[PDB]
Scaffold this active site. Structure first.
Site, short mmCIF file in Angstrom:
data_model
loop_
_atom_site.label_atom_id
_atom_site.label_comp_id
_atom_site.label_asym_id
_atom_site.label_seq_id
_atom_site.Cartn_x
_atom_site.Cartn_y
_atom_site.Cartn_z
N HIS A 68 0.84 -1.22 0.00
CA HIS A 68 0.00 0.00 0.00
C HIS A 68 0.86 1.26 0.00
CE1 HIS A 68 -3.05 -2.96 1.32
NE2 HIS A 68 -3.80 -2.25 0.50
N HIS A 72 1.81 1.57 -5.75
CA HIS A 72 0.40 1.11 -5.80
C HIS A 72 -0.53 2.28 -6.18
CE1 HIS A 72 -3.37 -0.67 -4.63
NE2 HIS A 72 -3.55 0.28 -3.71
N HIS A 106 -5.96 7.41 -2.96
CA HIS A 106 -6.98 6.53 -2.34
C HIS A 106 -6.37 5.84 -1.10
CE1 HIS A 106 -5.04 3.17 -4.35
NE2 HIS A 106 -5.78 2.36 -3.59
N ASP A 107 -5.05 5.69 -1.00
CA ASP A 107 -4.43 4.96 0.14
C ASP A 107 -3.48 5.87 0.94
OD1 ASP A 107 -5.54 2.36 0.41
OD2 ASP A 107 -4.25 1.54 -1.18
N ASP A 217 -8.19 -0.76 -8.01
CA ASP A 217 -7.46 -1.09 -6.77
C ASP A 217 -6.96 -2.54 -6.80
OD1 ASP A 217 -6.40 -0.42 -4.25
OD2 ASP A 217 -8.20 -1.04 -3.23
N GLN A 269 -5.17 -17.73 -2.84
CA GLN A 269 -5.35 -16.93 -4.08
C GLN A 269 -6.49 -17.48 -4.94
OE1 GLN A 269 -3.55 -13.88 -5.03
NE2 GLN A 269 -3.83 -14.24 -2.83
O1 LIG Z 1 -4.88 -11.65 -2.04
C1 LIG Z 1 -5.59 -10.75 -1.57
N1 LIG Z 1 -6.56 -11.01 -0.65
C2 LIG Z 1 -6.90 -12.27 -0.09
C3 LIG Z 1 -6.13 -13.46 0.02
C4 LIG Z 1 -6.88 -14.41 0.65
N2 LIG Z 1 -8.10 -13.84 0.91
C5 LIG Z 1 -9.24 -14.46 1.58
C6 LIG Z 1 -10.42 -14.58 0.60
F1 LIG Z 1 -9.98 -15.45 -0.42
F2 LIG Z 1 -11.59 -15.02 1.21
F3 LIG Z 1 -10.85 -13.37 0.14
N3 LIG Z 1 -8.08 -12.51 0.44
C7 LIG Z 1 -5.53 -9.32 -2.01
N4 LIG Z 1 -6.25 -8.42 -1.30
C8 LIG Z 1 -6.29 -7.14 -1.67
C9 LIG Z 1 -7.10 -6.17 -0.83
C10 LIG Z 1 -8.51 -6.48 -0.34
C11 LIG Z 1 -7.34 -6.58 0.65
C12 LIG Z 1 -5.61 -6.68 -2.80
C13 LIG Z 1 -4.85 -7.57 -3.55
C14 LIG Z 1 -4.81 -8.92 -3.17
N5 LIG Z 1 -4.06 -9.86 -3.87
C15 LIG Z 1 -3.04 -9.64 -4.80
C16 LIG Z 1 -2.55 -10.71 -5.60
N6 LIG Z 1 -1.57 -10.50 -6.51
C17 LIG Z 1 -1.06 -9.28 -6.65
N7 LIG Z 1 -1.52 -8.27 -5.90
C18 LIG Z 1 -2.50 -8.37 -4.99
MG LIG Z 2 -6.91 0.98 0.75
ZN LIG Z 3 -5.32 0.45 -2.71
#
Ligand SMILES: O=C(Nc1ccn(CC(F)(F)F)n1)c1nc(C2CC2)ccc1Nc1cncnc1
Ligand SMILES: [Mg+2]
Ligand SMILES: [Zn+2]
Length: 313
Positions: A68, A72, A106-107, A217, A269
């Site tokens: 962040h 980004h 935004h961040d 985002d 993922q």
């Molecule tokens: O991975 C992310 N969030 C996850 C991982 C596991 N869960 C639980 C689930 F699956 F229930 F949502 N959520 C993720 N989150 C975010 C923001 C919302 C927090 C942004 C990018 C993101 N990923 C990424 C992958 N590659 C390259 N840049 C960013």
């Molecule tokens: Mg944010």
């Molecule tokens: Zn962001």
């Protein structure tokens, strides 16, 4: 008015593509942002000396966190630039100005912790704002920088128009609260399928702009695999720091935030792509068909994570 920004040939071509990576040279990101605002808006819209002073105060109030950060910020603005350029008739002169500033801001002052960590830690910001804690902070940081001497990039606008663009920015920054995204996408799906979606209804625009902000985002999940893979190591570094700080408070973190569970990441993922990213970019493509390259690139990365799970990489 006659001071254009040019980019090297490869950047000038590649910057128009959704999958553009802004590169490792911090020093070029401002000129990249100015170039995008100048083509998205017009060379006139902003007084160049004020913009630059605004850009560098914004850069100053991003922190040195793995994900962040300033990079980004400009990445999320680039995605918005791509969307706006592939849907050029759909948006007002004011929306184009506002949305690119929103994405850059935004961040602001992000420390790498979620809203729920602020709540559990009992951070002062959670007392100020019970929902969208960091996002209301990010907006108030934007207003702060806008009120510094020589930083009002919107000075030329009428009281009325300044209020409109600050309200576009506020809604846009709030919409990056992923907790809000779920209902917002649900409502847009329903409105699209029943054919009641109407971009002249201002409350329908707001929702579509909200979904665009989520899309911009999350756009690190829509890059070429090698960039998505390396950016995922960045977000997980914040996640594992936050999990560490959860354990410090006496709270077993969810597995996603638990660095003792690095092995679970590829399956984590899959979860994220199926539950958040794929639905996000599907609904966006339905509403804004030229955004399809984001959905295509998202599906490719999902399929790259499936290859990781199956030991194929
Ligand atoms: O991975 C992310 N969030 C996850 C991982 C596991 N869960 C639980 C689930 F699956 F229930 F949502 N959520 C993720 N989150 C975010 C923001 C919302 C927090 C942004 C990018 C993101 N990923 C990424 C992958 N590659 C390259 N840049 C960013
Ligand atoms: Mg944010
Ligand atoms: Zn962001």
């Amino acid at each position: 008015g006659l001071m254009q920004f040019t980019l090297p040939v490869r950047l000038c071509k590649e910057i128009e593509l959704f999958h553009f990576d802004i590169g490792p040279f911090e020093n070029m990101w401002p000129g990249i942002f100015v170039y995008m605002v100048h083509r998205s808006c017009g060379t006139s819209c902003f007084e160049l000396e004020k913009l630059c002073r605004f850009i560098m105060s914004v850069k100053k109030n991003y922190r040195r966190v793995p994900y962040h950060n300033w990079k980004h910020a400009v990445t999320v603005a680039h995605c918005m630039y791509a969307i706006l350029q592939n849907n050029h008739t759909l948006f007002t002169d004011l929306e184009r100005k506002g949305l690119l500033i929103a994405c850059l801001c935004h961040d602001l002052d992000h420390r790498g912790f979620s809203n729920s960590y602020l709540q559990k830690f009992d951070h002062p910001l959670a007392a100020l704002y019970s929902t969208s804690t960091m996002e209301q902070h990010h907006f108030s940081q934007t207003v702060s920088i806008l009120q510094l001497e020589g930083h009002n990039i919107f000075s030329t606008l009428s009281s009325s128009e300044y209020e409109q663009v600050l309200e576009i920015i506020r809604k846009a920054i709030i919409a990056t609260d992923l907790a809000l995204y779920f209902g917002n996408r649900k409502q847009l799906e329903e409105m699209y399928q029943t054919g009641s979606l109407n971009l002249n209804n201002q409350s329908h625009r707001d929702r579509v702009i909200g979904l665009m902000m989520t899309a911009c985002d999350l756009c690190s999940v829509t890059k070429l695999w090698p960039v998505t893979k390396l950016t995922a190591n960045d977000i997980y570094a914040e996640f594992w720091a936050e999990g560490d700080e959860m354990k410090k408070l006496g709270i077993q973190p969810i597995p996603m935030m638990d660095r003792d569970k690095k092995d679970e990441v590829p399956q984590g993922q899959l979860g994220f792509y199926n539950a958040v990213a794929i639905p996000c970019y599907t609904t966006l493509t339905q509403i804004l068909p030229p955004t399809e390259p984001l959905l295509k690139a998202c599906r490719d990365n999902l399929s790259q994570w499936e290859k990781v799970i199956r030991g194929e990489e």
